[PDB]
């Protein structure tokens, strides 16, 4: 019933590990379909070969800008941006997968994986999934980031797709 997608992560081309995500399509369906479809690449464009452009140790890893590769772009499968579906789920801990945005109703394709409890984000970013397998791969990724987000090595989504 709820889809599961994976990401094979790479640090400058060396394979690092697989993170897999359960998308809560039963509560945030339109948000979950957009991450699912961008992971499969079935609509022609997507996450494969994009990188995490902003990694802040102890906060979150952000990625998903496949058009401009630096947080200023990305687009959804419904057009460039769409509404905040709802705020049922909250940022309760590491592994929560939440939507990045540029204020309300500006969701595109950027997402962030929390590596800590970030309750201040509640009510401001739609949560739509959580890490299933691979959280120590997300944790190891932190080491390649910095206080301001700049990463030291290129961290890419080498491959991604749907598992179930």
């Amino acid at each position: 019933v709820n889809p599961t997608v994976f990401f094979d992560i790479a640090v400058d081309g060396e394979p690092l590990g697989r993170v897999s995500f359960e998308l809560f399509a039963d509560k945030v369906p339109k948000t979950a379909e957009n991450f699912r479809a961008l992971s499969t690449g079935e609509k022609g464009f997507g996450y494969k070969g994009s990188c995490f452009h902003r990694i802040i140790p102890g906060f979150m890893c952000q990625g998903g800008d496949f058009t401009r590769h630096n947080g200023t772009g990305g687009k959804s499968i419904y057009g460039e941006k769409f509404e905040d579906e709802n705020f049922i789920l909250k940022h309760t801990g590491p592994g929560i997968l939440s939507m990045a945005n540029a204020g309300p109703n500006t969701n595109g394709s950027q997402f962030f994986i929390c590596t800590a409890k970030t309750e201040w984000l509640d009510g401001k970013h739609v949560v739509f999934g959580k890490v299933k397998e691979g959280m120590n791969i997300v944790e190891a990724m932190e080491r390649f980031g910095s206080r301001n987000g700049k990463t030291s090595k290129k961290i890419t989504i080498a491959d991604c797709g749907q598992l179930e």
């Binding site: 947080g71 200023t72 945005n101 540029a102 204020g103």
Partner: protein
């Protein structure tokens, strides 16, 4: 607008009704003239974008000018967005996010966000940027409201030199051009468009004569 409050902590103080009444009166009698831009800058010192929006909404009439101002504000916002891109992502707990192109115009930015952007260290000059945009718009409007061009200013046969130079300098100030061009424009147009007798009187003084000598020449 925010103001330094005893002691050393800026707190938000809403715009006073007397300031709004003064603004409505100056946009009722002075209407649109060169002096309105300086009056506006003095009535809205350190004003949050909400206060400037309030001061621009209270103007009754002249809807074309207000629409020009709104469109130029939108154009400046688009240019600021094209020059200062805003990266998406979660904000830091200590510092505030970089304001977008429309967060300056107070359209989608709540008052608390603006107060934060102003009182934070380092401060974000949202108020001064929006004031620069409104001042560009007001310059456009006052250069549009000019009845005649500066090239059309000519003195009447018996019209005294006083009224002629007053009207000429008023139209020149209302006109929009670089100061370097004005330096040639004055020395080329002031003496030429005068009355023939006063024309010869000023030419007897010399080409580089100052304004006071040129005046006291034809005085009376």
């Amino acid at each position: 607008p925010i103001v330094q409050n005893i002691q050393g902590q800026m707190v938000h103080q809403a715009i006073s009704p007397r300031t709004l009444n003064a603004w409505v009166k100056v946009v009722e009698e002075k209407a649109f003239s060169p002096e309105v831009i300086p009056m506006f800058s003095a009535l809205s010192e350190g004003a949050t974008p909400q206060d400037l929006n309030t001061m621009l909404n209270t103007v009754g009439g002249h809807q074309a000018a207000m629409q020009m101002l709104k469109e130029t504000i939108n154009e400046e916002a688009a240019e600021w967005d094209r020059v200062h891109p805003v990266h998406a992502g979660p904000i830091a707990p200590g510092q505030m996010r970089e304001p977008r192109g429309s967060d300056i115009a107070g359209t989608t930015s709540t008052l608390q966000e603006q107060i934060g952007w102003m009182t934070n260290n380092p401060p974000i000059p949202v108020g001064e940027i929006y004031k620069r945009w409104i001042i560009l718009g007001l310059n456009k409007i006052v250069r549009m409201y000019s009845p005649t061009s500066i090239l059309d200013i000519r003195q009447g046969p018996k019209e005294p030199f006083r009224d002629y130079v007053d009207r000429f300098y008023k139209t020149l100030r209302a006109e929009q051009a670089s100061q370097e061009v004005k330096n040639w424009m004055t020395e080329t147009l002031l003496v030429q468009n005068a009355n023939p007798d006063c024309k010869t009187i000023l030419k007897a003084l010399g080409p580089a004569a100052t304004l006071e000598e040129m005046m006291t020449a034809c005085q009376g």
